[PDB]
Ligand binder design. Structure first.
Ligand SMILES: *[C@@H]1O[C@H](CO)[C@@H](O[C@@H]2O[C@H](CO)[C@@H](O[C@@H]3O[C@H](CO)[C@@H](O)[C@H](O[C@H]4O[C@H](CO)[C@@H](O)[C@H](O)[C@@H]4O)[C@@H]3O)[C@H](O)[C@H]2NC(C)=O)[C@H](O)[C@H]1NC(C)=O
Ligand SMILES: *[C@@H]1O[C@H](CO)[C@@H](O[C@@H]2O[C@H](CO)[C@@H](O[C@@H]3O[C@H](CO)[C@@H](O)[C@H](O[C@H]4O[C@H](CO)[C@@H](O)[C@H](O)[C@@H]4O)[C@@H]3O)[C@H](O)[C@H]2NC(C)=O)[C@H](O)[C@H]1NC(C)=O
Ligand SMILES: *[C@@H]1O[C@H](CO)[C@@H](O[C@@H]2O[C@H](CO)[C@@H](O)[C@H](O)[C@H]2NC(C)=O)[C@H](O)[C@H]1NC(C)=O
Ligand SMILES: *[C@@H]1O[C@H](CO)[C@@H](O[C@@H]2O[C@H](CO)[C@@H](O)[C@H](O)[C@H]2NC(C)=O)[C@H](O)[C@H]1NC(C)=O
Ligand SMILES: *[C@@H]1O[C@H](CO)[C@@H](O[C@@H]2O[C@H](CO)[C@@H](O)[C@H](O)[C@H]2NC(C)=O)[C@H](O)[C@H]1NC(C)=O
Ligand SMILES: *[C@@H]1O[C@H](CO)[C@@H](O[C@@H]2O[C@H](CO)[C@@H](O)[C@H](O)[C@H]2NC(C)=O)[C@H](O)[C@H]1NC(C)=O
Ligand SMILES: *[C@@H]1O[C@H](CO)[C@@H](O[C@@H]2O[C@H](CO)[C@@H](O)[C@H](O)[C@H]2NC(C)=O)[C@H](O)[C@H]1NC(C)=O
Ligand SMILES: *[C@@H]1O[C@H](CO)[C@@H](O[C@@H]2O[C@H](CO)[C@@H](O)[C@H](O)[C@H]2NC(C)=O)[C@H](O)[C@H]1NC(C)=O
Ligand SMILES: *[C@@H]1O[C@H](CO)[C@@H](O)[C@H](O)[C@H]1NC(C)=O
Ligand SMILES: *[C@@H]1O[C@H](CO)[C@@H](O)[C@H](O)[C@H]1NC(C)=O
Ligand SMILES: *[C@@H]1O[C@H](CO)[C@@H](O)[C@H](O)[C@H]1NC(C)=O
Ligand SMILES: *[C@@H]1O[C@H](CO)[C@@H](O)[C@H](O)[C@H]1NC(C)=O
Ligand SMILES: *[C@@H]1O[C@H](CO)[C@@H](O)[C@H](O)[C@H]1NC(C)=O
Ligand SMILES: *[C@@H]1O[C@H](CO)[C@@H](O)[C@H](O)[C@H]1NC(C)=O
Ligand SMILES: O=C(O)CC[C@H](CP(=O)(O)O)C(=O)O
Ligand SMILES: O=C(O)CC[C@H](CP(=O)(O)O)C(=O)O
Ligand SMILES: [Ca+2]
Ligand SMILES: [Ca+2]
Ligand SMILES: [Cl-]
Ligand SMILES: [Cl-]
Ligand SMILES: [Zn+2]
Ligand SMILES: [Zn+2]
Ligand SMILES: [Zn+2]
Ligand SMILES: [Zn+2]
Lengths: 687, 687
């Protein structure tokens, strides 16, 4: 039963697994990552799984040149390189020994050696560039942009920059965002040293997976696009730096004041916007020599065969590749999955099987754009779309230690509420209380009433292809602090010791996340009726219809002129509410003894997420096919609701053909109303 | 049981229903068609169906102007209209009374009054226009084209013509194609009078359905494209004529000889290719004033709820709208469905239910581009794709009386072989023999050995959206003669009397088709294991891989230069063969007493057709998503195999960038190999 499963999970095992996974770097595409894959595969096998395979793909990755390193220089009027950024981060204590730690770089940067004047853009958000090209009249064309990490996925920044005319982008971590007051720099606390740099890919894939093979798995005979038709590649050079190198680049900055305090970070510089220095006369020069190359990656796929519904799949998945040691990102999640597997494997050895098939993935090349999960799902899309019950992600278990952070489909809200009431809170001062209670006290619902917050799914992690492309019900759960990443994110300093010393010394937060993650997978794979509640979707559809309506209503004159009505969407939502309500009644009133009727009802619950998929995709985003949710076009990490309408409405005041534009709003309202109505009809009596 | 069902079908009932359906015209969008819909709905209800609804859509139709009729003129040097084509066909005996019979027109022609020189193009096939622009050097630009009906769908002709530069198209029926020797003109035989004209739409929809709403049902709040972005509309005027009016237009034709005898039909004219007349000096002038208009259509949808698997759908569908009386096209099929329904309804009244849900459709606006079936399937696509077992079409039951013509997915071959051996042949001189035997003797397999021919599915009928877009296993069966249509196709002369007197006086061929159609639907809806044989797909995949390979091999030098290999496709096919073979074994070896295992296996059989769908669609044909089959791009009526590769290879010698072109061949080989491999993997053990 469930308690047997939950009781078999040990904090000390997680600790032991995390330590094992963090001793050397496991960069995607390296032999070391391959060996960790082989090792996971052997162990998941010894743990009891019925089968464990490696699935590999040949995908575009990116790597710095070993003998021609990347850096940024201030040059002078003659071409003397006055200042030079780091070539590497100062390795932490006792790892000065590291074989090779990849130096900081922006994965998928083109090669280049541009120079020019600097313009500071804050976080390089859409609103930042609006304030700058619209209010301030500064002009980024031909400039090198310099932006701080935080707020939004760094891919959006590069795209915003690229589109505003920039010839290069420099990213850095500012202590305002990456140094929490009163805590020390690593190795003596969990803050980011002025020499720490955040690695990370800067693609805009929009769900495509491998850049060269959109639509189809990068298998042995894959046909690939030439790199010039590749998906998501930035066209200007980009490089990240720490805040020491940053001060050096920022302190000589001229032009206009920062437009206000929200543009100014913590270093002792003015945070002038530029362009150029006070100093005229010197320029910034970038040196980028990273190369893109097709490289083999490996997913580990374990299978625990279901006793009754083997042709129904509950998937627990998270990635194995790290930028360096992956002390938090991903091995604190990977060590949790290892212990979940060990625990299910234990029950199986004593002769239990779950009701449905459970699938366990160790994904590769996630850091490079969710490539392993995506290629695997393109290869197995027909199985997934007819057999896929749910997907539970398992990246970083902790990014803090204040409370639970849950993002999931509405179908799993009730499941998550019930599971957490059955779990002990590991929180100081809530001993003998449930996780539900601490989580609700600490992160209260905005909606209300006495409920916790649960957020929408966007992207930036491996659930993306399962939810956004395929319409498989998905959730994730981790411990969090009070979109920027904790301070030591994607740095050489994110190590086992960072976690053992400063994050979770007892491994008690890991154990909690293992219980929430393994708990969901257990209920999903074993409850006789799928634990989804379609009425929960009815409720959020109404909130999102209100929301998108309110946004349109900021423009009453155009709504009159063009006859923009939301009547069809509200009507659809009202029908989905009534039909879901009747479906719940039938679900309460039938005999679980009749298997075929059970299967029919479970198939309705199962295909309901699926009903929100449009096979034509969203406008310009063929791999984002869900109509209710998509990643924000301004921030991959953030979930947006009614994305088609949201984007047709965004900055609509600026389109030059208002009636073309409002026409497309109307078209999107129609697609949404229709999809919500069609989804609802999946829950009607079937004949 | 089956025999009870088959024995309840009566030839005399079919006769009575066909007579009832043919007394007045039932043109899509008219009140008369609406009343026939209401009537079908009441009767299917009295017959016993559990529910019967009307589903309506507002779609673009096309109609001649009542007070400004269409015709073609020869004008002279001054503008005197010397010759004028008919305004209508001479109505048949006793129907000179007809309320209104729509005059001959090409549905969806733009309006226009162009004049110019005539060029004769034979059947206006791709090869005809090749022979003419390549061999003969004649140039169709600014000319009016005149082409005979036959060989290919008239939409392709208009598209070929349009693309070759034409300013108008005139279609006519030539007696070579539409007058069988030794038979008389209607009313005294079944041949086409020199005053008969074939009506018909001339769209290129490529599966889109309603022109204005591709992707989504043309419901109440549908957003519609402006007519200029409508799908499939021809841009030059087109009008059809009989062979009397044709002789008048052809007899004065100048320019070059016909390139050979295959270009010459039966009228006493030279069949010169033009351009222009001998007569200089006079021109041809077209007068077209038809209008396009959004018009309401109605499908009748009856439901017979399944006793065990109600959430599994077997669909019997065919259209109700006719160009005029629809004596053969469609009411000889519609009267068969009426009798099938009556018969199932009888069993139900005695307390039987089929195992699966059976759905019965009377589709509207088929003649106008399969619009009713398509809109309905877009509206209900999520139900269809998860619950759809099979679709059996039911258009014209007879287009002759020589033998059976069956087109279907390979999955149904074995079903059709077994059903026909259990059926009496209605053929003169095969009394006491089975339909299988007459059908095999009369239409022998080309493949071999002692098997009948079964052809591929293309399009030109209502199964299109179910098979080509959705991947639902589909078949059709009718009686045929020894792609052009019988002689009285889409003419005022296709009447009840044409059928009672000359086609099927006993109604014995109708009864046979009712038995083959209702027989399939019965087995599909009642057999405990779905009657599909996946090994039959294995066999044809190998033949098609051979075929497409041979076509590529007409170009060995390019295959070397570009490294074009079919190794992946053959490998996929070989694996599909082995895995299908193992799947058959398991299907033989499991206990039908275990329902969940039964359901799992039926779901594999059911989703196997579905596995061949690519959600990205074929190149440029987003609504044709099946990878093994598509309608021919040169002839909608014809099925083509490995369409993606076939079209990348077609006329490849002429592409100006041979390596771009051969690259796309390679990409298509990859898509096909991958899809065949993925389809096969749906038949593997599921865990
Ligand atoms: C939510 O579910 C409800 C079903 O409970 C559903 O309501 C349906 O709405 C449509 C209109 O939106 C109705 O269709 C109408 O009724 C009949 C057809 O049976 C016609 O007379 C009407 O047509 C006339 O009026 C039209 C416009 O007002 C004209 O354009 C037209 O040419 C006619 O002259 C009209 O088609 C239908 O009756 C209800 N169904 C009910 C109440 O049972 C609603 O649409 C669902 N929401 C969504 C978004 O799907
Ligand atoms: C039909 O089914 C068979 C399975 O029975 C399947 O065969 C598979 O083919 C691929 C090659 O096409 C094999 O993968 C290889 O084997 C190992 C990985 O386990 C590697 O050593 C190989 O890689 C080396 O060589 C490559 C090229 O030759 C190099 O590019 C590469 O970098 C390596 O140095 C290679 O990946 C696989 O072993 C078999 N599976 C078997 C026999 O079990 C076949 O592909 C299926 N057909 C289709 C079209 O799917
Ligand atoms: C993590 O643990 C694994 C397995 O417990 C260690 O690898 C095993 O132990 C030794 C290492 O040579 C061998 O006898 C086994 O063959 C290894 N088993 C495998 C790979 O499954 C591994 O070395 C540990 N990693 C670290 C850095 O501690
Ligand atoms: C920053 O780095 C550059 C590159 O290594 C340094 O300039 C080089 O210096 C050597 C010897 O002085 C010369 O042979 C090269 O011509 C220089 N390379 C280039 C491309 O300029 C530079 O001195 C460094 N600057 C600082 C302040 O340390
Ligand atoms: C979460 O728990 C609640 C409370 O147990 C569950 O709702 C009950 O479920 C039973 C079983 O069908 C019903 O008979 C009760 O009427 C329900 N109570 C309420 C308040 O609805 C709910 O099913 C659980 N959610 C899951 C398991 O997903
Ligand atoms: C075809 O048969 C139908 C039904 O048998 C005829 O319509 C019915 O018969 C009379 C006609 O006014 C009425 O009492 C019924 O209400 C009609 N029933 C319906 C419409 O379901 C119909 O007129 C026949 N058509 C022809 C031309 O013979
Ligand atoms: C073919 O049809 C046209 C159109 O009806 C005939 O020409 C018309 O004749 C009347 C009276 O003679 C004139 O008022 C119109 O000007 C003509 N219309 C046009 C547009 O030309 C023509 O005579 C007919 N030709 C034959 C041979 O019957
Ligand atoms: C068509 O009929 C053949 C002959 O009856 C069927 O094949 C037999 O099916 C039974 C039932 O599984 C097997 O045990 C026999 O071994 C089969 N004989 C052969 C020659 O295969 C076949 O199943 C029928 N096809 C259908 C119903 O789709
Ligand atoms: C890296 O740069 C070296 C040293 O200058 C050069 O020889 C080599 O081409 C580069 N390797 C690649 C292509 O990354
Ligand atoms: C920015 O500067 C360049 C000239 O160097 C110009 O072409 C570009 O259009 C400018 N952008 C704006 C907003 O004026
Ligand atoms: C872990 O828990 C303590 C308790 O408040 C917290 O303040 C400390 O800073 C936490 N560690 C991190 C990395 O936030
Ligand atoms: C048909 O032509 C008539 C008569 O000349 C004209 O008045 C009317 O506009 C036309 N109707 C339409 C638009 O089909
Ligand atoms: C046919 O004629 C026109 C001139 O009237 C010309 O522009 C067009 O390109 C010609 N086509 C060919 C194949 O020469
Ligand atoms: C019907 O059957 C006879 C028997 O040969 C055939 O010759 C006759 O022409 C058929 N009718 C039609 C329309 O083909
Ligand atoms: O490519 C993405 O969508 C995200 C990759 C990675 C996700 P993770 O850092 O592993 O949480 C990142 O944000 O840089
Ligand atoms: O639009 C089509 O695809 C075909 C419509 C109709 C099919 P049918 O004549 O009813 O067999 C025709 O060929 O003109
Ligand atoms: Ca791919
Ligand atoms: Ca449509
Ligand atoms: Cl996660
Ligand atoms: Cl048919
Ligand atoms: Zn990461
Ligand atoms: Zn991660
Ligand atoms: Zn027709
Ligand atoms: Zn027809």
């Amino acid at each position: 039963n469930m308690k047997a499963f939950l009781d078999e999970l040990k904090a000390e095992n997680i600790k032991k697994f995390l330590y094992n996974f963090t001793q050397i770097p496991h960069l995607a595409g390296t032999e070391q990552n391959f060996q960790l894959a082989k090792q996971i595969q052997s162990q998941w096998k010894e743990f009891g799984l019925d089968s464990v395979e490696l699935a590999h793909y040949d995908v575009l990755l990116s790597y710095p040149n070993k003998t021609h390193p990347n850096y940024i220089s201030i040059i002078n009027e003659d071409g003397n390189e006055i200042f030079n950024t780091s070539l590497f981060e100062p390795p932490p204590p006792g790892y000065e020994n590291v074989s090779d730690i990849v130096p900081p770089f922006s994965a998928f940067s083109p090669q280049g050696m541009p120079e020019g004047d600097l313009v500071y853009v804050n976080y390089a958000r859409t609103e930042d560039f609006f304030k700058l090209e619209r209010d301030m009249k500064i002009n980024c064309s031909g400039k090198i942009v310099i932006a701080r990490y935080g707020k939004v996925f760094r891919g959006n920044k590069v795209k915003n920059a690229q589109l505003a005319g920039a010839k290069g982008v420099i990213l850095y971590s500012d202590p305002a965002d990456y140094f929490a007051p009163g805590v020390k720099s690593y190795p003596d606390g969990w803050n980011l040293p002025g020499g720490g740099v955040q690695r990370g890919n800067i693609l805009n894939l929009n769900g495509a997976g491998d850049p060269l093979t959109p639509g189809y798995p990068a298998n042995e005979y894959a046909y690939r696009r030439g790199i010039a038709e590749a998906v998501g590649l930035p066209s200007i050079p980009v490089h990240p730096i720490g805040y020491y190198d940053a001060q050096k680049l920022l302190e000589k900055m001229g032009g206009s004041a920062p437009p206000d305090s929200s543009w100014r970070g913590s270093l002792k510089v003015p945070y002038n916007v530029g362009p150029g220095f006070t100093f005229s006369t010197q320029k910034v020069k970038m040196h980028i020599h990273s190369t893109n190359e097709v490289t083999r990656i490996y997913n580990v796929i374990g299978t625990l065969r279901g006793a009754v519904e083997p042709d129904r799949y509950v998937i627990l998945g998270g990635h194995r590749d790290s930028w360096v040691f992956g002390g938090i990102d991903p091995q604190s999640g990977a060590a949790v999955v290892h212990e979940i597997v060990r625990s299910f494997g234990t029950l199986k050895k004593e002769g239990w099987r779950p009701r449905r098939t459970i699938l366990f993935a160790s994904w590769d090349a996630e850091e490079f754009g969710l490539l392993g999960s995506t290629e695997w799902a393109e290869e197995n899309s027909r199985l997934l779309q007819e057999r896929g019950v749910a997907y539970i992600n398992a990246d970083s278990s902790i990014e803090g230690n204040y409370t639970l952070r849950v993002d999931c489909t509405p179908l799993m809200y009730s499941l998550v509420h019930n599971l957490t009431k059955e779990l002990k809170s590991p929180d100081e001062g809530f001993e003998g209380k449930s996780l539900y209670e601490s989580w609700t006290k600490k992160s209260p619902s905005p909606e209300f009433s006495g409920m916790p917050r649960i957020s929408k799914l966007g992207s930036g992690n491996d659930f993306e292809v399962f939810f956004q492309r395929l319409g498989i019900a998905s959730g994730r759960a981790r411990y969090t602090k009070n979109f920027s990443g904790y301070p030591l994110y994607h740095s050489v300093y994110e190590t086992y010791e960072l976690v053992e010393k400063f994050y979770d010394p007892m491994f008690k937060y890991h154990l909690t996340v293992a219980q929430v993650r393994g708990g969901m997978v257990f209920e999903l794979a074993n409850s006789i009726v799928l634990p989804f509640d379609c009425r929960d979707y009815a409720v959020v559809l109404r909130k999102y219809a209100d929301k998108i309506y309110s946004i349109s209503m900021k423009h009453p004159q155009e709504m009159k002129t063009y006859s923009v009505s939301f009547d069809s969407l509200f009507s659809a939502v009202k029908n989905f509410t009534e039909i879901a309500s009747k479906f719940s009644e039938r679900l309460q009133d039938f005999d679980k003894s009749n298997p075929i009727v059970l299967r029919m009802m479970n198939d309705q619950l199962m295909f309901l997420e699926r009903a929100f998929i449009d096979p034509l995709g969203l406008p310009d985003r063929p791999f984002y096919r869900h109509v209710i949710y998509a990643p924000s076009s301004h921030n991959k990490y953030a979930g947006e609701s009614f994305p088609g309408i949201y984007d047709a409405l965004f900055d609509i005041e600026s389109k030059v053909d208002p009636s073309k534009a409002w026409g497309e709003v109307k078209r999107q309202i129609y697609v949404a109303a229709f999809t919500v109505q069609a989804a609802a009809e999946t829950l009607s009596e079937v004949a």
